[PDB]
Amino acid sequence: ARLKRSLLKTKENLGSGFISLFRGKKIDDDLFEELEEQLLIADVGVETTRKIITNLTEGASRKQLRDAEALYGLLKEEMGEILAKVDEPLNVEGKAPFVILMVGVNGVGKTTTIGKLARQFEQQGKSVMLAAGDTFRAAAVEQLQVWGQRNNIPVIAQHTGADSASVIFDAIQAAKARNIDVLIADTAGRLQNKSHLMEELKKIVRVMKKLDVEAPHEVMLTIDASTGQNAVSQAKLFHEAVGLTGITLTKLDGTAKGGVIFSVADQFGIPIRYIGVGERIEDLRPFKADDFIEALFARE
Numbered sequence: 001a002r003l004k005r006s007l008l009k010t011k012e013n014l015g016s017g018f019i020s021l022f023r024g025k026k027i028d029d030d031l032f033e034e035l036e037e038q039l040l041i042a043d044v045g046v047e048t049t050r051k052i053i054t055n056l057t058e059g060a061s062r063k064q065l066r067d068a069e070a071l072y073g074l075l076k077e078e079m080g081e082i083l084a085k086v087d088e089p090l091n092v093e094g095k096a097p098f099v100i101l102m103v104g105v106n107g108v109g110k111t112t113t114i115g116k117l118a119r120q121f122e123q124q125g126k127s128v129m130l131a132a133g134d135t136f137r138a139a140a141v142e143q144l145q146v147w148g149q150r151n152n153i154p155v156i157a158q159h160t161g162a163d164s165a166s167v168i169f170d171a172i173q174a175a176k177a178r179n180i181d182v183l184i185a186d187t188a189g190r191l192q193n194k195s196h197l198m199e200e201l202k203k204i205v206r207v208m209k210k211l212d213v214e215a216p217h218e219v220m221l222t223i224d225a226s227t228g229q230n231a232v233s234q235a236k237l238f239h240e241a242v243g244l245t246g247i248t249l250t251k252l253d254g255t256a257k258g259g260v261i262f263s264v265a266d267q268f269g270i271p272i273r274y275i276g277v278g279e280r281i282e283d284l285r286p287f288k289a290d291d292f293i294e295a296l297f298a299r300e
């Protein structure tokens with residue numbers, strides 16, 4: 001029930017938060033407007049809120065419901081369906097190496113997610129290597145090097161400002177030579193220039209093909225739930241630039257903006273591989289839609 005308390009701030013307005021809104025009320029246009037306002041304040045987003053209201057209105061009409069309290073169950077089903085469409089756990093087994101290209105802006109949890117994932121894979125018996133492909137941020141590169149040395153995890157890094165694609169190429173070659181199961185590659189996160197960063201990512205992906213026609217095996221976006229709609233605009237920008245195959249959504253604990261997960265799910269349809277629900281390694285949890293919905297909707 002750790003997930004339940006990590007969602008405590010989001011549950012004021014969503015899930016169990018619906019109970020106080022519906023109590024004793026009739027289903028009418030006023031109620032659907034109050035619900036729409038609550039969804040929007042919770043960062044569910046305009047398009048996804050409209051879809052939820054439309055589907056809920058139709059679902060209640062088909063059953064000729066009049067008691068607003070029963071909208072709780074319909075919302076649980078319908079918001080559950082939104083998340084079920086992006087429930088698909090990441091499987092990194094069986095490659096040599098499985099290459100995860102980590103993309104996203106700076107400051108939203110990318111290097112922390114790299115460390116937690118690396119520790120989780122090693123805890124499962126997989127060997128891990130890191131590639132310090134954010135080559136102009138010497139602090140980020142030093143962070144991976146020092147942390148990897150402490151953890152007996154090899155880190156491939158080159159001089160400040162080295163070509164990111166070449167660093168990652170060299171890391172894949174090294175991983176293949178050293179029986180590495182998983183290679184996790186960091187990338188630059190300065191999206192102030194759309195064209196440049198997005199051209200760098202395309203170059204990285206093309207260069208990988210010299211060594212493995214299947215690499216990268218996962219392109220993972222990291223976004224921060226506490227940034228609300230910025231998480232959605234970041235996903236949209238990276239989705240148009242590169243072939244995203246997974247999303248990690250960090251910092252759900254302690255934000256009232258957790259509703260953004262429904263917007264990310266609905267707008268892009270990309271699997272949410274992990275959600276960050278605390279500061280421990282194990283608090284980067286593989287995303288399971290039914291578990292999340294149960295925690296969000298359970299009262300108390």
Ligand SMILES: Nc1nc2c(ncn2[C@@H]2O[C@H](COP(=O)(O)OP(=O)(O)NP(=O)(O)O)[C@@H](O)[C@H]2O)c(=O)[nH]1
Binds near residue numbers: 105109111112250276
């Ligand atoms: N509570 C919480 N904090 C998280 C989570 N994921 C990352 N963080 C925190 O947010 C920060 C991580 O951001 P970070 O990975 O440093 O982003 P970055 O771009 O790699 N680094 P920088 O901050 O130098 O730009 C740290 O405070 C880290 O502990 C999460 O799921 N929950």
